[PDB]
Design an enzyme around this catalytic site. Structure first.
Site, PDB file in Angstrom:
ATOM      1  CG  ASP B  13      -2.221   0.793   1.044  1.00  0.00           C
ATOM      2  OD1 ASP B  13      -2.582   0.935  -0.129  1.00  0.00           O
ATOM      3  OD2 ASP B  13      -2.757   1.351   2.043  1.00  0.00           O
TER       4      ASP B  13
HETATM    5  C1  ISY Z   1      -5.252  -4.821  -2.697  1.00  0.00           C
HETATM    6  C2  ISY Z   1      -3.980  -4.616  -1.962  1.00  0.00           C
HETATM    7  C3  ISY Z   1      -2.729  -5.058  -2.568  1.00  0.00           C
HETATM    8  C4  ISY Z   1      -3.918  -3.787  -0.710  1.00  0.00           C
HETATM    9  C5  ISY Z   1      -5.166  -3.308  -0.014  1.00  0.00           C
HETATM   10  S1  ISY Z   1      -4.778  -1.596   0.260  1.00  0.00           S
HETATM   11  P1  ISY Z   1      -6.126  -0.666  -1.111  1.00  0.00           P
HETATM   12  O1  ISY Z   1      -5.577   0.699  -1.323  1.00  0.00           O
HETATM   13  O2  ISY Z   1      -6.328  -1.592  -2.398  1.00  0.00           O
HETATM   14  O3  ISY Z   1      -7.493  -0.610  -0.327  1.00  0.00           O
HETATM   15  P2  ISY Z   1      -7.964   0.442   0.864  1.00  0.00           P
HETATM   16  O4  ISY Z   1      -6.718   1.028   1.638  1.00  0.00           O
HETATM   17  O5  ISY Z   1      -9.006  -0.165   1.847  1.00  0.00           O
HETATM   18  O6  ISY Z   1      -8.654   1.571   0.109  1.00  0.00           O
HETATM   19 MG    MG Z   2      -4.082   2.166  -0.993  1.00  0.00          MG
END
Ligand code: ISY
Ligand code: MG
Ligand code: ISY
Ligand code: MG
Lengths: 236, 236
Positions: B13
């Protein structure tokens, strides 16, 4: 007000550490913990939270000593008999439910749950769920069993099984807010310990080092303030 | 060595925040992130971890812009074509699998996955799972569907459904370590975002504010050190 969670759930922990810390019995730790619940539930109600879940007993917890477990059961009966009776008959008008494998509990605790649920059945205020003999894996398996029984009896085809169907067979089917917006865990550990699992894909986690016997209304407020500062993107 | 997790999982992330921060394209954020993976997988192997899972793409992520998603897919093909080919043919002898709804991916990415899996099929070193188009709710529902199909065809009765049966129908059925011991999430958010759910009842969570493009071998080490300092009681 939008930035107010619909469903808040709390994992209580740290009672024996607290007792150790204060030179006192673990049972006193547990009793001082349970005495905090009423002010937390009041506070959540005042804040406009729609559902507050307090997790009190996991299946794993049954592997503790017999006397520890029996004391917990008795304290919970007492909580349901006094504090909860006061909450559901107050102007907060709380609706009380218990979730979990209630058959594993002592008949007296089962009766105390029945009483409090019956007494609050018509109430319109905040829902309060006491999760007792509740485990997240066990929820999922029992949902799976109920769905399979329906498939066996022709009511459901396998390709009809979707999230929403799976959701209506969990123990949280008693709420329209099954997924917590905010999960609080006291006492510093960062793990679920077989609480909700299905329920948690987007829940905000808040972990406080505070031991639950020290946990009060201000600690709820602190978790809520952290909540309001979170950015929730839900993957997209 | 006992205090070494069998299964470590990582939620990546913070790539766009990182790009924003450095005045650079989000795509460059993603590419610099993916370039870290090989050193992390090497490090986990050296440390004697038995399974490392990196989560790269959720179902929710498909709701991002078309071009962002297509660039991710291409970067992953390239990762599987170079870096992963190097890892599985090195002396680390890594075994490569991908989990998720692979039918949703571009045929080329599906082919790149097939290639890397085939190339490593006989390897005996650390398992590396790339979770792509993988969501925890979706896993559970698809397990539920497979079990219901078996019930429909007489292979299984509803009361035969237990944890272990449910476990053998998830996407993690390819490992004997489906449940992570340690879950790492980069970039400061404290939530699962529809990663594993069934898999996480006792997993230790470690959250670092480090944005994943800045995340390297030392950050794995830091999570492992936090891990070794955790006391795991499993409810009892
Ligand atoms: C799908 C992943 C590799 C990581 C989940 S973090 P993503 O930014 O996709 O989702 P949120 O922080 O809940 O908005
Ligand atoms: Mg994210
Ligand atoms: C069952 C609850 C009310 C809380 C889970 S915390 P518990 O001490 O039971 O479980 P662990 O910390 O994983 O050992
Ligand atoms: Mg504890």
């Amino acid at each position: 007000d939008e930035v107010t969670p619909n469903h808040v759930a709390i994992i209580i922990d740290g009672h024996r550490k607290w007792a150790k810390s204060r030179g006192v019995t673990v049972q006193e730790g547990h009793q001082t913990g349970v005495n905090n619940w009423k002010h937390i539930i009041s506070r959540a109600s005042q804040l406009g939270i729609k559902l507050l879940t307090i997790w009190a007993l996991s299946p794993q917890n049954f592997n503790r000593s017999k006397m520890e477990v029996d004391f917990l059961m008795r304290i919970y009966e007492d909580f349901l008999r006094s504090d909860v009776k006061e909450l559901v008959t107050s102007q907060q008008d709380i609706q009380f439910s218990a979730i979990g494998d209630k058959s594993r509990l002592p008949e007296y605790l089962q009766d105390a749950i029945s009483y409090a649920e019956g007494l609050s059945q018509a109430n319109k205020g905040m829902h309060f769920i006491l999760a007792v003999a509740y485990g997240g894996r066990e929820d999922i398996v029992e949902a799976a069993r109920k769905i399979a029984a329906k498939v066996e009896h022709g009511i459901l085809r396998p390709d009809d099984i979707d999230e929403a169907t799976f959701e209506q067979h969990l123990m949280t089917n008693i709420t329209k807010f099954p997924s917590p917006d905010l999960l609080i865990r006291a006492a510093g550990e960062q793990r679920l310990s077989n609480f909700f699992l299905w329920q948690l894909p987007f829940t905000e986690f808040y972990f406080t080092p505070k031991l639950f016997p020290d946990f009060g209304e201000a600690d709820l407020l602190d978790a809520l303030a952290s909540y309001r500062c979170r950015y929730r993107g839900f993957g997209e």
